[PDB]
Design a binder for these strands. Sequence first.
RNA 1: GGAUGAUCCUCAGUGGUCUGGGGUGCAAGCUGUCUAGCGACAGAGUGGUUCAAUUCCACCUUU
Lengths: 451, 474
Amino acid sequence: VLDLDLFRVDKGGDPALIRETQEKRFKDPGLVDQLVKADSEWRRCRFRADNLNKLKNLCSKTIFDDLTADALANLKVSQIKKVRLLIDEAILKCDAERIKLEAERFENLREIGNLLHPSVPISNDEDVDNKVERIWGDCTVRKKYSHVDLVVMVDGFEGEKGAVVAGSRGYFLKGVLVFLEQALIQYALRTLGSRGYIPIYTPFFMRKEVMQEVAQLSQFDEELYKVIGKGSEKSDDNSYDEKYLIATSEQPIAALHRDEWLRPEDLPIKYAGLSTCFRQEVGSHGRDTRGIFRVHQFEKIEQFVYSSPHDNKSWEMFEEMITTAEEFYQSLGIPYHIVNIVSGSLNHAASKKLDLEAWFPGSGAFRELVSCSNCTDYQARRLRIRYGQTMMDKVEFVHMLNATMCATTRTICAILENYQTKKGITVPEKLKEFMPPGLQELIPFVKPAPI
Amino acid sequence: VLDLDLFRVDKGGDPALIRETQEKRFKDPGLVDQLVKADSEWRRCRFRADNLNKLKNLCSKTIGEKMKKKEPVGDDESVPENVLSFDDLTADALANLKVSQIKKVRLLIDEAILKCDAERIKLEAERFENLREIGNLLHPSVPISNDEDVDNKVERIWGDCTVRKKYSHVDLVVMVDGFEGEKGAVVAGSRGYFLKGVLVFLEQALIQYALRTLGSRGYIPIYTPFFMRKEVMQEVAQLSQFDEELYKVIGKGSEKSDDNSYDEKYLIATSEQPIAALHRDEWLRPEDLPIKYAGLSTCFRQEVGSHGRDTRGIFRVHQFEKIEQFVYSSPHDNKSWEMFEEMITTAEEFYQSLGIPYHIVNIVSGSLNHAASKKLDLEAWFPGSGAFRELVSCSNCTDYQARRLRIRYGQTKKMMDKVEFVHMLNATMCATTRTICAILENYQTKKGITVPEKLKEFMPPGLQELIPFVKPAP
RNA sequence: GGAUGAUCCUCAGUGGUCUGGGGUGCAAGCUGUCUAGCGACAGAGUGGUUCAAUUCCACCUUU
Ligand SMILES: Nc1ncnc2c1ncn2[C@@H]1O[C@H](COP(=O)(O)OP(=O)(O)NP(=O)(O)O)[C@@H](O)[C@H]1O
Ligand SMILES: Nc1ncnc2c1ncn2[C@@H]1O[C@H](COP(=O)(O)OP(=O)(O)NP(=O)(O)O)[C@@H](O)[C@H]1O
């Protein structure tokens, strides 16, 4: 949620930059001017409300014109009371007004995107105007057998029984791949565990009031599932509470330090989120439908950092994190290329996102496997997470960063497609440590490819 | 669900066994008097239906005879009378009526067929409603009482020694800096928790360990979905569970912007449930000897029963990982009851392997869930808390869930004799948080916690030997 | 029923826009509006009775 002073030309900022940054995001402006009107009205109405209460008190201080009052002392009892009761009608009306404006001003503010780093590409088309920054590994080789057939050929995936139980995209990951999953977990956990990231296991659902602070509408509409609880552990209570399953570990970790004052000294704080993530995936029908590349439920290990805003500690930590992931996917021997995402494809929170598109040889194309984002002070202001616990003056919030270390399932797929042979898939050297006796060497085929 | 025939007196079994089963379960036996009622009426509607069909054919037959006796005869308009009453008819009457009258009467029979169809459906539905909440048969060896603490019976004890220590799991989880209760209550509501740092590894160890243990003993590792469709969850859970355990999740039921419809799902409270639904509506082959599955899944409980119990730590939470041993077995040669006793020793050995003192218990009838025929509760000793807590449950549901999910013993050896369903059993290998609490109370020191030999292997470098305190106990 | 939430802390008092004693800081904290700035005004959990609520009452929250 951007600072309101950026809309006041009276105060520090200018909205013309906001508008421009909305256009760059390719979200229709106006929202900025709906904001500014609603705010300006709310100032006038908070000014009136003030002045009226100033008279409300002016009159008990004293104890036929009302538009504006002077140092009044003439008349009393009935003559003053009537005026004060008429003023009270005025405050009721200015109260209804204020509440309406406040609510609707913030309605507009809620869906205005964060500021953009200059380096971000300014276009709406992603295929065309996305820029690759770095390229690693062997990016042109191919192996023909896709991750679907591969996942089947190992006897690790039940897509039919998963469609029965959970209803399309639902799945039973079975046997050896479970150990393979676990490996990736353990490996990523140890990696980050060494680099000063503290591991953390999060809750999977939230209290809405909290979720609303960490998610934008779109996500509520086409991503977040909703949970319905009792909101009390008594049989007497037939009341209900709406909770929401998390789509990322970013969300629960972001809220971890809600409404706190974080000291500059302890401030560079790295969290290693461990969480299962539920997404409805309403955007994408008929996309990656067979395998487990794209599914409604999957474990994920995430890098979330709270950083100081002042210098460029945020954007150094950023470049560090992205490079962190790089070293992870370099170590498993996966070829990839880093891409800089266009302004249209950024979510409100982010100021800039660099994604790691890994090479899928069997499929013969580049699929996304890691995103990295710097939200700056956007989430922070909303979660009221400031910088230092109270000197004066001018309240400054932290900068918050979030990037995925490993998305267990899509990474598993990348492994399968890149390390296939004739017997099966070769286990990359890093994981051999954590793969059980028998798979340390390889992952053997036991089933044939479906036709 | 049970078998209807053992409700039917003219058929095999007796229903006074069932009413007795209820009395032992301390539930209502009047439920069965309702079952027997709706079944009786449903039979009546079956009988009439049949008799009615017979008549319909007899109308098409008498119609047959008309053309032979005369192409023209009598009157083609007149309406029928008295005959219509379908309780009692002949062929004489049908022979008397002209063609037209028999044709219309045939239509009235067809109307009455549809009326039966409807009413038959209503009875079937009501009988079922009665049947859902009727408990499985009890094994004699199960104790027969309602309260558990007084009338539970201990069968086995292992390990040392009803020993005591200090620092409950409540204080332990804090002292190691692995638990954030206050900020997790803010995020996820009451009882919610952030598990952090070292415990995360500890948990991951347990998982990794149990998974290799069972993965060695022939169990097939399996990762379940965490939510199930209404239909199927309804097949695997009972009403009280829906009221006081299963959270309700709501999806869109279609991945198109266009779609405004929603689909109601439910989050699982055990891996039992998605695994039971793995092989729904299937004929399990006799050759595939007891199929063993290692279920790895997080489990959501609303935990509505209990208010103000174990509120501080991670002992009772609304979300926790769990490893379950689930086997499909044969009902013949008491094979399930053997594997039952095997599976319990399996968990026994694991917890022996972790040096955790415990004792096996037979659970009383009055606390048993409908599905189970008999449940074994491995209760591990908490020195720091100073008591024994339920850590593991293993249950043999026999054919109950089986009958419900339509999972039969293959084609069976013979046909047209009686369809026999499989026996299915479910047991918890590891309850990560409760296990973690068990370990923290059993390996505690003053330096921190000692890592159990087996887990040392899976701990990351530096945490293989022990886990150090960093904070003081409140 | 008691305690509580936002006027430096603390005890006591009180319908007069708060008072007093003791302690602490500086030469009295937080939010918001107005003014170019100086600075002024409004807000004290929510409502009521009262012109007037720190008090009285209703009420809640956390405990
Ligand atoms: N349906 C899904 N199943 C599994 N992982 C997913 C899914 N959608 C997104 N992700 C994860 O999100 C990470 C990076 O993409 P992210 O930006 O988080 O979501 P996104 O941009 O919506 N990706 P997509 O929706 O697949 O184009 C990947 O490493 C994936 O693991
Ligand atoms: N509130 C809870 N939090 C975490 N795990 C639980 C909880 N309740 C039960 N379990 C797990 O499930 C098994 C306990 O017995 P089970 O029969 O599944 O549930 P239960 O008998 O209802 N136990 P409880 O609900 O604590 O009285 C153990 O493996 C537990 O760790």
